[PDB]
Design a protein around this ligand. Structure first.
Ligand SMILES: *[C@@H]1O[C@H](CO[C@@H]2O[C@@H](C)[C@@H](O)[C@@H](O)[C@@H]2O)[C@@H](O[C@@H]2O[C@H](CO)[C@@H](O[C@@H]3O[C@H](CO)[C@@H](O)[C@H](O)[C@@H]3O)[C@H](O)[C@H]2NC(C)=O)[C@H](O)[C@H]1NC(C)=O
Ligand SMILES: *[C@@H]1O[C@H](CO)[C@@H](O[C@@H]2O[C@H](CO)[C@@H](O)[C@H](O)[C@H]2NC(C)=O)[C@H](O)[C@H]1NC(C)=O
Ligand SMILES: *[C@@H]1O[C@H](CO)[C@@H](O)[C@H](O)[C@H]1NC(C)=O
Ligand SMILES: *[C@@H]1O[C@H](CO)[C@@H](O)[C@H](O)[C@H]1NC(C)=O
Ligand SMILES: *[C@@H]1O[C@H](CO)[C@@H](O)[C@H](O)[C@H]1NC(C)=O
Ligand SMILES: *[C@@H]1O[C@H](CO)[C@@H](O)[C@H](O)[C@H]1NC(C)=O
Ligand SMILES: *[C@@H]1O[C@H](CO)[C@@H](O)[C@H](O)[C@H]1NC(C)=O
Ligand SMILES: *[C@@H]1O[C@H](CO)[C@@H](O)[C@H](O)[C@H]1NC(C)=O
Ligand SMILES: *[C@@H]1O[C@H](CO)[C@@H](O)[C@H](O)[C@H]1NC(C)=O
Ligand SMILES: *[C@@H]1O[C@H](CO)[C@@H](O)[C@H](O)[C@H]1NC(C)=O
Lengths: 316, 282, 211, 227
């Protein structure tokens, strides 16, 4: 069943500085007490991250374009954020990736789904037994021509209705492989992402193999007893916050401690001090003058000057 | 799961099953001696266990003994032109075996059917099902029964006791796709017993080298496979079957110096093996 | 479709002398797929030989035969007092009629007794006259009824018994059933037994009404 | 161990229906192809039908086509044979037998039976159960030859399944002759069981015959008079 319901308030999206967040292990190579420089698709330090709300009413889950690599963060305790859908048309014509972390299952199917324009979930909390059970499964209408299937061992979930845990994800789809990097960390503040540095470990490498140019986030509803309206305008749920950033081709300096974990990082093309630190392969630079790069004036226009002749050649 | 099954589809409506995301062992199938016909095109039967592929298409059907050669590139006949056609450059293998004692019914078996007449040629990997009665003369057909209007479908009639050319044979065709894509099906990879404290070659998940493997005290994170040094040199590897960290030490080597006085003073010489323990010299 | 004709139909043999059993298949495309069985009359068939060449577990080394083509022959090296059974051949879609093996013995003179219906039988409404051949060998004879000094057939039933093991002999019992209205008309009822081992056929006459 | 237990069968009027079951224990019943066969009284074994591992493909014989259905569920672990519109020539004892499966790359049935279960007797007739009628068969003078003699009994109009007989509570055999029953007109099974006992022995011990009739539990004992 496809349901298109919108009763939310209208407000422009917010933005935040990404800070020193969104650093993932570029490779499975162990390094101890070694400063290593890599050139990959990273989130720039202090980037402009987009901020989305799911307060009670806001249910903003827009169809954002999927540029090369996507950074994702989520702070919540009601676990309304479930999964993501990836594709080009988000229609039956083209293959689309679908990942759902529902009540008890974590499912990953790449299929030519006929997605409803407003995909979501829904949980009924019956007071007869004081249990939450997902009564609404409304994301796609048809599932045909399935190619890759992968289900993890089912894990039951509380599904409480209401910002103490942070789930950081990096989705990078290159060379026919969709790479997921994940990191779960306890967060005390309930309004903004922390300034502390965190390293995102690889989670799963799915050989999916499609153009991914527009990704969407799937949320769930927690209608228990507060909604008297029909199931087209009346709903209720908890609070959620998720941030979306874009990855760019960047050169980074990564610091490994003796245990092999990334404890610090430096974005080379951020500021002259950072670029100098990258050049010296060190996190501390002594007093002095260091040559780092070359400044070049970039061209502004293009001019073409050809003879004013117009007669066509006698190729006929 | 697909070929132990007791049901095989009709040739004109054959069953195609896709195979992906697994490891395929063709050598064990080839070694087993219970099949009476095996041939391949574009590849030799002995090498499939060493190749990787992106998709496998399994076609299953049942045909008579005297028709098994029709499933081949560049072939013509009733099956090749009305039921099942494959391209001239078809890359794969056609296998067939005796199922006479399993797919026959008394007085001719009508549960299995083939297309006798069709209006056009069959494209490779083209499946068609139709029921309009064929027209061959000057009498209306395609919905009406007249003179010389015959159904464009016919039954083998697999009798329980027939000649080898009429007994039902289960034919399975494996179609292979060499398209540029991440491989999903490959031959099973094999590992040998680990040996430590010796100068021995190693191939750890594609990391190849020579050295001495020793038990190490390092602590990889539970996603890393091998370590590196400051100068980007492989120095530790996690074993893929024991999840154990092994330090890699280059095999002892060095220069050989011949300390000697003048040849006219004496011929006695001494040999210096640089940076070599005397136990490893012999 | 296939017919398995077993030859000979009945083979008689001494307890020690050997023999062979032959089977003919109508359509000889079995490619040496054949099975042999030995079944006592009172218990299930037991497997003897698979693929017509090899022997299964528990089969003695005596059972060993081989055959090719339409003529499949199974040989038995020696004999013991256990072959009082029926040998059956098996193709995938057919079976044999069966061949019985009998222990030979010297010819025995049958002894026939005639029992008339009793009074309890007399009041029921159906009269049965029974003839019992006892201690008779070998298994081939004919029994005839003479009612009112005239033979008749198609009205009596004959029954045979499996040969005993203690002394290798059998018995045959035959009953003639009729209504009382027909029974009272006649007065003389005789039983004639014919046997190739007898010098003359044996006649036994009975008078109705006892004495 | 490994055995097959047959259930069902018995008396049934012609043109009726019946169900036969074969319970299995001790072996993987799903993976083996199954067979049903029968044996007429005093005749050879006659094959009936097949069934696959899942239980969908059968090749019912020409004698049993159209009116016999075979079913094989894997969970309940038993085999079924349902018969409709039974005719008189089908009076027999049915066995259920396995088919040798090699378990290899192909299951590859070998068209051979390895284990024979204990079957049941099925009888089709228009008659009904009735009590047997008995009367002693004691030779009189001029009918008994020599010191040794034979003494026995004839049973008549005994329609149901075969009955067993004994003498003196089965305390002696003296070479009992079984005399298997025979079928006559109007559906009657009859047998004359006789034990060879010398005639010059009656008078000091009583001779009692016991027709142990199990089906309808009509146990009868008879006394033989020397006439
Ligand atoms: C092969 O010849 C064709 C056809 O040329 C025409 O017919 C010949 C028999 C002679 O009589 C020619 O003189 C005559 O032009 C050539 O194709 C032609 O290409 C030209 C240039 O692109 C086309 O002119 C344009 O066409 C469209 C309108 O149709 C507009 O873009 C312009 O207004 C302009 O007229 C011309 O239509 C086209 N001819 C035809 C019939 O479609 C061709 O160039 C020549 N081969 C080579 C290699 O030069
Ligand atoms: C991968 O698929 C995407 C999704 O359509 C393609 O991107 C679009 O390409 C068309 C080509 O006409 C452009 O007009 C659109 O603007 C593109 N979309 C975006 C968001 O940039 C892309 O071309 C595909 N690539 C290949 C190699 O097939
Ligand atoms: C982020 O985007 C918002 C859009 O309103 C803008 O106000 C802000 O200055 C941007 N920050 C940057 C580009 O650093
Ligand atoms: C878990 O698996 C079941 C069975 O395949 C599936 O239908 C379901 O979607 C999954 N769980 C939930 C809670 O949706
Ligand atoms: C999946 O396959 C069918 C035929 O097997 C094909 O027609 C179809 O295009 C594919 N599905 C979709 C949703 O495009
Ligand atoms: C490294 O790991 C050890 C345990 O192996 C731990 O005691 C130590 O604190 C870690 N060092 C750092 C700098 O985190
Ligand atoms: C064309 O070329 C002529 C000859 O050089 C020049 O005089 C004239 O200005 C040109 N015209 C244009 C429009 O450029
Ligand atoms: C399969 O993999 C596990 C994980 O490496 C390993 O412990 C196990 O021994 C492997 N099985 C083998 C080598 O037979
Ligand atoms: C070796 O020794 C002799 C005697 O001392 C000396 O004369 C000669 O030159 C020497 N040979 C060389 C090649 O120096
Ligand atoms: C040679 O090997 C022995 C035994 O392992 C070791 O104790 C010793 O230190 C080594 N010698 C040198 C010079 O490294």
């Amino acid at each position: 069943q496809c349901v298109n319901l919108t009763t939310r308030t209208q407000l422009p999206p917010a933005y935040t500085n990404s800070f020193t967040r969104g650093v993932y292990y570029p490779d499975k190579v162990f390094r101890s007490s070694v400063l290593h420089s890599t050139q990959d698709l990273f989130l720039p330090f202090f980037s402009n991250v987009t901020w989305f709300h799911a307060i009670h009413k806001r249910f903003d889950n827009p169809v954002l374009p999927f540029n090369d690599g996507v950074y994702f963060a989520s702070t919540e305790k009601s676990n309304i954020i479930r999964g993501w859908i990836f594709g080009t048309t988000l229609d039956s014509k083209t293959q689309s990736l679908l990942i759902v972390n529902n009540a008890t299952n974590v499912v990953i199917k790449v299929c030519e789904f006929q997605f409803c324009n407003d995909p979501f979930l829904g949980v009924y909390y019956h007071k007869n037994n004081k249990s939450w059970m997902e009564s609404e499964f409304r994301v796609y209408s048809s599932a045909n021509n399935c190619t890759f299937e992968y289900v993890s061992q089912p894990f039951l979930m509380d599904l409480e209705g209401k910002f103490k845990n942070l789930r950081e994800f990096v989705f990078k789809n290159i060379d026919g492989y969709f790479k997921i990097y994940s990191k779960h960390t306890p967060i005390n503040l309930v309004r903004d992402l922390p300034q502390g540095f965190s390293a995102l470990e690889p989670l799963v490498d799915l050989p999916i193999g499609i153009n991914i140019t527009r990704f969407q986030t799937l949320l769930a509803l927690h209608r228990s007893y507060l909604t008297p309206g029909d199931s087209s305008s009346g709903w209720t749920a908890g609070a959620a916050a998720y941030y979306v950033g874009y990855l760019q081709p960047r050169t980074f300096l990564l610091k490994y401690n003796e245990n092999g974990t990334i404890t610090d990082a430096v974005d080379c093309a951020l500021d002259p001090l950072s670029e100098t630190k990258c050049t010296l392969k060190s996190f501390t630079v002594e007093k002095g003058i260091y040559q780092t790069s070359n400044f070049r004036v970039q061209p502004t226009e293009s001019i073409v000057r050809f003879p004013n002749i117009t007669n066509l050649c006698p190729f006929g | 799961e697909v070929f132990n099954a007791t049901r095989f589809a009709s040739v004109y409506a054959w069953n195609r099953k896709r195979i992906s995301n697994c490891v395929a062992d063709y050598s064990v199938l080839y070694n087993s001696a219970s099949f009476s016909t095996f041939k391949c095109y574009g590849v030799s039967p002995t090498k499939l266990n060493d190749l990787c592929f992106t998709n496998v298409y399994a076609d299953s059907f049942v045909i008579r003994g005297d028709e098994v050669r029709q499933i081949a590139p560049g072939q013509t006949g009733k099956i090749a032109d009305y039921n099942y056609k494959l391209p001239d450059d078809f890359t794969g293998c056609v296998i067939a075996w005796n199922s006479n004692n399993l797919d026959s019914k008394v007085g001719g078996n009508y549960n299995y059917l083939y297309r006798l007449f069709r209006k056009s040629n069959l494209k490779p990997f083209e499946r068609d099902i139709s029921t309009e009665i064929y027209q061959a003369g000057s009498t209306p057909c395609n919905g009406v029964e007249g003179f010389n209007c015959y159904f464009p479908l016919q039954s083998y009639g697999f009798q329980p006791t027939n000649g080898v050319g009429y007994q039902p044979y289960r034919v399975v065709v494996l179609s292979f796709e060499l398209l540029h894509a991440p491989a999903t099906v490959c031959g099973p990879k094999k590992s040998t017993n680990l040996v430590k404290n010796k100068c021995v070659n190693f191939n750890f998940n594609g990391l190849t080298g020579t050295g001495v493997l020793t038990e190490s005290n390092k602590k990889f994170l539970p996603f890393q496979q091998f370590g590196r040094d400051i100068a980007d040199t492989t120095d530790a590897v996690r074993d893929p079957q024991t999840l154990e960290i092994l330090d890699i030490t280059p095999c002892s080597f060095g220069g050989v110096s011949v300390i000697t006085p003048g040849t006219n003073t004496s011929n006695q010489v001494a040999v210096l093996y640089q940076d070599v323990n005397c136990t490893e010299v012999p | 479709e296939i017919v398995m004709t077993q030859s000979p139909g009945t083979l008689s043999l001494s307890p020690g002398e050997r023999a062979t059993l032959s089977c003919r298949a109508s359509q000889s495309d079995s490619s040496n797929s054949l099975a042999w069985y030995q079944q006592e009359p009172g218990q299930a068939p037991r497997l003897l030989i698979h693929d017509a060449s090899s022997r299964a577990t528990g089969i003695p080394d005596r059972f060993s035969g081989s055959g090719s083509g339409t003529d499949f022959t199974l040989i038995i090296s020696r004999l013991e007092p256990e072959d009082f059974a029926v040998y059956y051949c098996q193709l995938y879609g057919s079976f044999g009629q069966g061949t019985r093996l009998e222990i030979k013995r010297t010819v025995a003179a049958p002894s026939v007794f005639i029992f008339p219906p009793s009074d309890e039988q007399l009041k029921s409404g159906t009269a049965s006259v029974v003839c019992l051949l006892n201690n008779f060998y070998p298994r081939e004879a004919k029994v005839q009824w003479k009612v009112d000094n005239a033979l008749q057939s198609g009205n009596s039933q004959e029954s045979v018994t499996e040969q005993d093991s203690k002394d290798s002999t059998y018995s045959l019992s035959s009953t003639l059933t009729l209504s009382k209205a027909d029974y009272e008309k006649h007065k003389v009822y005789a039983c004639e037994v014919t046997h190739q081992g007898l010098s003359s056929p044996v006649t036994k006459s009975f008078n109705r009404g006892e004495c | 161990e490994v055995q097959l237990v047959e259930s069902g069968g018995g008396l049934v009027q012609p043109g009726g229906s019946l169900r036969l079951s074969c319970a299995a224990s001790g072996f993987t019943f799903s993976g083996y192809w199954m067979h049903w066969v029968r044996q007429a009284p005093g005749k050879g074994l006659v094959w009936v039908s097949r069934v696959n591992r899942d239980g969908s493909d059968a090749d019912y014989a020409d004698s049993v086509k159209g009116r016999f259905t075979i079913s094989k569920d894997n969970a309940k672990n038993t085999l079924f044979l349902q018969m409709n519109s039974l005719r008189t020539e089908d009076t027999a004892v049915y066995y259920c037998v396995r088919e040798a499966t090699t378990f290899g790359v192909i299951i590859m049935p070998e068209w051979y039976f390895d284990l024979w279960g204990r079957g049941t007797l099925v009888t089709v007739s228009s008659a009904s159960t009735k009590g047997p009628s008995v009367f002693p068969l004691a030779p009189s003078s001029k009918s008994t030859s020599g010191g040794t003699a034979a003494l026995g009994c004839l049973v008549k109009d005994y329609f149901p399944e075969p009955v067993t007989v004994s003498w003196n509570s089965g305390a002696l055999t003296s070479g009992v002759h079984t005399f298997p029953a025979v079928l006559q007109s109007s559906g009657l099974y009859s047998l004359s069981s006789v034990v060879t006992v010398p005639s010059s022995s009656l008078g000091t011990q009583t001779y009692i015959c016991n027709v142990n009739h199990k089906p309808s539990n009509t146990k009868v004992d008879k006394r033989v008079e020397p006439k």
